[PDB]
Amino acid sequence: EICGPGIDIRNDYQQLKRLENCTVIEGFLHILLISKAEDYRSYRFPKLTVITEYLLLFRVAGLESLGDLFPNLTVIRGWKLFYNYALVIFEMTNLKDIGLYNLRNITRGAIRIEKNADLCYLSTIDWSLILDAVSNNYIVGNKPPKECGDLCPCEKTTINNEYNYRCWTTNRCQKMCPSVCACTENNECCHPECLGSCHTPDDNTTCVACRHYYYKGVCVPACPPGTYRFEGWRCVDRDFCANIPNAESGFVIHDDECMQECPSGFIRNSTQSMYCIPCVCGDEEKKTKTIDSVTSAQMLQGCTILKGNLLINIRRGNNIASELENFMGLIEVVTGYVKIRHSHALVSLSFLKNLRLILGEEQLEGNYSFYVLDNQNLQQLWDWNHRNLTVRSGKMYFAFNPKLCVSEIYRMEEVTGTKGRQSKGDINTRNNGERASCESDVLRFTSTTTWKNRIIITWHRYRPPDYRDLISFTVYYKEAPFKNVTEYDCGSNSWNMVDVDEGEPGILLHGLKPWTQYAVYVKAVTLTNDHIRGAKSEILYIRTNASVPSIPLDVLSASNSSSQLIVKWNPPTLPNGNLSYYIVRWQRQPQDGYLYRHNYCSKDKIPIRKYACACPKTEAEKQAEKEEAEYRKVFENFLHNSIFVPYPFFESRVDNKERTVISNLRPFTLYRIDIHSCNHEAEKLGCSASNFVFARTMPAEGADDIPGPVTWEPRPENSIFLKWPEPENPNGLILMYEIKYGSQVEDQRECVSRQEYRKYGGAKLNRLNPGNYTARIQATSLSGNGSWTDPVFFYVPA
Amino acid sequence: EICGPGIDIRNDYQQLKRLENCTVIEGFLHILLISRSYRFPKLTVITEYLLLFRVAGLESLGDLFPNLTVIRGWKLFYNYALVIFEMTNLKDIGLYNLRNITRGAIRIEKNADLCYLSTIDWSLILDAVSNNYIVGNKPPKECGDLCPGTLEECEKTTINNEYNYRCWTTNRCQKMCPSVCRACTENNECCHPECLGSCHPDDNTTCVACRHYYYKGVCVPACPPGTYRFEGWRCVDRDFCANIPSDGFVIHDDECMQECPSGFIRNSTQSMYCIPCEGPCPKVCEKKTKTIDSVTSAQMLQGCTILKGNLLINIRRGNNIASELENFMGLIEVVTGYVKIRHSHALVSLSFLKNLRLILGEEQLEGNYSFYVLDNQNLQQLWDWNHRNLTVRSGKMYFAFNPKLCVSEIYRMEEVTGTKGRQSKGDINTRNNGERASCESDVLRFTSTTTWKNRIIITWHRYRPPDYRDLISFTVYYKEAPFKNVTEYDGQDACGSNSWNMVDVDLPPNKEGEPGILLHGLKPWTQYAVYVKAVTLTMVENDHIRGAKSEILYIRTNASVPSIPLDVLSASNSSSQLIVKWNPPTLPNGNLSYYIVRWQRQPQDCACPKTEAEKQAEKEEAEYRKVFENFLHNSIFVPRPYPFFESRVDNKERTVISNLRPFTLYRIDIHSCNHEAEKLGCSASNFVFARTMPAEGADDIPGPVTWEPRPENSIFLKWPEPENPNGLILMYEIKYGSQVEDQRECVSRQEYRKYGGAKLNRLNPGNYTARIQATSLSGNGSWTDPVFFYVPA
Amino acid sequence: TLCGAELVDALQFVCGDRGFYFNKPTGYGSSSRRTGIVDECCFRSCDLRRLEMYCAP
């Protein structure tokens, strides 16, 4: 059952009863301003399934979700939108989710849901499968994501990056249809005259809500002759439109549609007022008519004469231009001024195609007629040798519009015959289209050059149309690692300009990072009628001469074993030339002879060798910080100016990694390791400077054992000289010898240096008491203790 | 023999022989990056610093400088006097004769083998020791040097309360000349104190480095009035410097200085004399234009306050320009011709020019133009101020195509520059100059604030634009500001990051929750200056946009407790007396009042930045909601038709303390009170120990040592225990013998107390004798009377 | 002056129970004479007198 032409639910919960009856809502559906002061009784309305035009929800206190109220809503074609939209919900408390599972296909508009944080389950449901212009939707301001975290009770398809739970509530899920196609309840593309779903597949009548027209239970893509196309969803008889209560103050059959009014010169035929035969809109009150949205514009469709004004401004969206053409094109003549401001999707005014005659009668201030301002992405005026245009009166103006070409205005002032009207201000030239120009004379580079830090560019000397124009030059440039770079207009590497004035005109760029592919191009600045040309030039690339590299970093190392050394480092912060390899040198380190020179057996302590928010920076700190940095700078400035030719050293040539293992080394020895980076241009340049490191090889642990049997001998007054060989390869360096011995337990402890050991070949405790005795030795190497050697016996009798 | 002016040495060991001849270096001394056997005994004294950097293959220093004695440090190196850096294979600081480092402080870092360090005092060779810098050497557990004596030393001393000898290298010793008088020589003779270092005693002609000046072989504290001082050590006659190689070294205050300092200028009449004047050195600077684009191209203007010509300012961009740009040019007084600034964008306000007072324009520009500014995208503020007696007397001014400068500012110009009736009427084209600025505003006010010593809460009024909807997102600025001569254009030069830290608050979720803010991370007792500006978003323009900003407000945190004083060190001029030296604190946190000193004997054994690319992006949204809103209302509604003691260190960083006991430890604590501790509480703690080292009078026993004819042959040496030894006896040493004491008795008190004397049993009959030097807490100094335990038959 | 949401609630606070007036459309002429509110109460200020014009009878 159908209903028209609109419903206005307001202030009266009871009033909702007006939806008791039908399911085809011709016109619109307003639901606004319903206080929850009345308790909610779940007024179900199932029959309804489709509405032609927009659906509006505004401030209905007391509603929790939508399915409760609307179970069967499937499709909304949206003939006459509501501010470029089809369904809009605004300022809704109490509202938890949108139980609109049954919806599958929405045709024209977009969805705007805003300022309702009382709700979630938004980032789930995909719309792209419903409508097309997803980029015209608008959903923010509802509850932040990190407080929602909702989970479905269904299918999972990537939501622009990844799939998750697409379910219109905690009790339903998002339907879909496999790649079969129309669609049915269970996976089948029905009669291709369908929309939404069909009861049973492939029928002219069983389709739940069939698209593309409607007629007497049938679905056709073209109404029969006696019928007519009505409201873009049905077909009608002559009698029905003959009995329509217009209340515009019977529709006119034309082109087989029941249209109410008629284009110009098409008048109700004499006694056939039901038909228009061939033989202008706006009001005198407002005198102006802004245009922002299709509703603001579709309410203008069908006019050719216009009185008033044309204020135009559009903030965002997809190719609205398509629609604005599809309507405004019929316009030809306007009385008052035309003005444009802040428009951003007006790529080009081409949609006002059939405008030819402008009056400019009621002019703006300064008696202005054609007025543009600040509109960013407008790049081309429709003025081309097809559309002539004769501005009667008034004056023009342009400002800030950065994408048009500064000569398009010239063709315009040509065609409109006002080239002798406006001043340099009235049509600015400093700041219009400057961010992209059309075309001009070309220039040629005479010759380039390159040192390691400086460059002198020479272009070919230009000559102007009239020589008394001082033709100066500018030179734009920057670093470029790539070619995905424009040329058109610091800080985060944007650009840097320089100015310049009988020799060939050249210029000198200086103090440049070595080996950086700078991009350069000259631009012609005039110094003077619109007879200016200027001259762009070519995007030239230049890589500066190579230079000596910078020392490495990250210099760390250790020993996974004896005579093996692992060292990792950092590539240079300034390679300055394609990398070639690194060099590694090393040296043995002479042990500290003082250990030799000063016996430490008698010493009371022995040495050991380990092996292998944003709190804003205040002022006073920052001062000393910068000073420290300056200090290190003036310090390494010296070492920066040195060349370097590529116990002896032993070299290496590592190129691939920044870490290496070394072999062929004595065990547990102190080593030091010089490192250099080395570019591929040091054949005559010279290889990099040096940064060192220290390291100590691994024990060897296992050689502090006395290399034989520990042997004794007696002497006169009981001086037992002991014979034990020195462990030839001590762990680093051998200091002394732990000597335990005694009658029953070797409780008594003895210390034996390396002088006496070299003085006698052992040690000798003199005047010992007799009895049965045995002895042991432990060594004292550099790594630590030795090993408590075998008990050997000796019995000086009593 | 003089030797100047400096010495640069690099990459050529042989270049070292550039020193073969001279004896005193009149300048700096660099040594850098050398790839044997060399000695230079001529060198005695330096006047500038000394730098050693990465010269591998060098054994010590003194082997290259065996007679560096004193370094007068007359021209430092980044506030330093001696700097070593990265000297592989340098085992030990060979310099064993450096005596009175005048000014700087040592800087030694990252050297593999620079041990023999803690075994060298600094307190007797320079005076500001605690400003040194020592890191990255051999960690103090890995070399453990020795000192000349393995059997017996030179002297040992205290510092930081410990003992050790004082030796540079294993074959040299540091030499303290004792307190005999105080300048010295070898063998401890008191030289004529007017010299320094060494003396070849009471000589005025036979020493190495005359302190305090030098003249004609004679030490002197002031050279005669014909002899003018020079380089801080030596004087010369009048004609000398004149005949020495822009003129020479002008005479001033008995000096032949290279440049006579600030506060003077040369009397061309005898141009070698410069007279003090009243002005700040009026210096002048062919052509009449002088372009500027970046920081450097101004370099040739630093200081000359008078320029003969014009200025053409064209800066595209750079770093935080205004600061150093001004510091280069900010001194200009009066420029002759015109002034013009074109196409230059990175400028925000021209205040960097400080002292433009008179601009005369004797070279006008086309059509008699003196003041020309043109197409500067980011200029907002002219230094034309409430604080300029600026004066112009020629040419018309000109202004064109500068949006960020409203006409009301430039309007006050001619009424403060006296150039009203001179300019034409189309010059100030109110069409463009000052369109998109915001110079008319509504003024915010404040309500209240609270100030914890390190936190601030401030709250201001509630703003209400003509329309409610227009976003309000307040943005607040503050900066550390020790003064009041400050207004909001200092660093806001398209960088903005110099002199206004900024944070953002957001609209309160409360319908009537008054919007204030807390700020943290502060500095106590440091006047901040804050203010707050109301970020509208939209064309609230009736004619031009409104905008709204507070007015600047100063604040300062409540005071708080001071911190620990620095560098508690101390020396004993005598035993039983101690003198302290310490460093004033770091964060006074308020006016300092005085210090607290005590002593006590001791016992025995969420980042908040705004991503601007989002910022303006957020504007449109709330803006976009605005217009969409109004369509709703415009279409719905329809009208019907152990004691311790205390003192008050009040003014000085040095105080003695008296009447102690010698060689007795003392925990020393300095506390420091601000003027706020009386209700808050005083400093934290800083401790140090300092034994008033003795005094050998009471090391040996001054009581009579009596032997005893004992039972089975033995000698009981009953000397009474001294009542007050020099502290106490560790162990007794009794050298005994027949008549020349042949062996020595070792008696600890553990071996003495239980006895109270000394017994030697089983003696070979025959007369004997002995003597005692009790190793006491002052050490084995004075000897006892040589006791006679003669035991003949 | 009032604009924004501060408007809507205020109107309830002047209507309360009585609701709002709506000019119901019946025959759906493809046209409508539609000066509103924020033209009035958001560019100048308006009294609590004329607000009745919008409140239902």
Residue numbers in the entry:
A (entry chain D): 1 to 153, 162 to 189, 193 to 260, 265 to 294, 301 to 510, 515 to 526, 532 to 558, 562 to 645, ...
B (entry chain A): 1 to 35, 41 to 158, 162 to 189, 192 to 210, 212 to 256, 263 to 302, 306 to 625, 671 to 706, ...
C (entry chain B): 4 to 37, 41 to 63
Q: How does the study describe this entry?
A:
The type 1 insulin-like growth factor receptor (IGF1R) is a class II receptor tyrosine kinase (RTK), belonging to the insulin receptor family, that plays critical roles in cell growth and differentiation. IGF1R and insulin receptor (IR) are closely related, and share 57% sequence identity and high structural similarity. Each IGF1R and IR protomer consists of the L1, CR, L2, FnIII-1,−2,−3, transmembrane (TM), and kinase domains. Two such protomers are linked by multiple disulfide bonds, forming a stable, covalent dimer.
In this study, we determine the cryo-EM structure of the full-length IGF1R–IGF1 complex in the active state at an overall resolution of 4.3 Å. We successfully reconstituted the complex of full-length mouse IGF1R (MmIGF1R) and human IGF1 (HsIGF1) in vitro for cryo-EM analysis. Our structure reveals a Γ-shaped asymmetric IGF1R dimer bound to only one IGF1 molecule. The IGF1-binding site is formed by the L1 and CR domains (CRD) of one IGF1R protomer, and the α-CT′ and FnIII-1′ domains of the other. The distance between the two membrane-proximal FnIII-3 domains in the IGF1-bound IGF1R is ~39 Å, which is much shorter than that in the apo IGF1R dimer (~65 Å). In our structure of the IGF1R–IGF1 complex, the C-domain loop of IGF1 inserts into a groove formed by L1 and CRDs of IGF1R. The aromatic side chain of Y31 of IGF1 is sandwiched between P5 in the L1 domain and P256 in the CRD, and is further surrounded by several other conserved hydrophobic residues in the CRD, including F241, F251, and I255. In the asymmetric active dimer of IGF1R with only one IGF1 bound, the two α-CT motifs from both protomers converge at the FnIII-1′ domain and form a rigid helical beam. The L1′–FnIII-2′ intra-protomer interaction in the membrane-proximal region further stabilizes the active dimer.
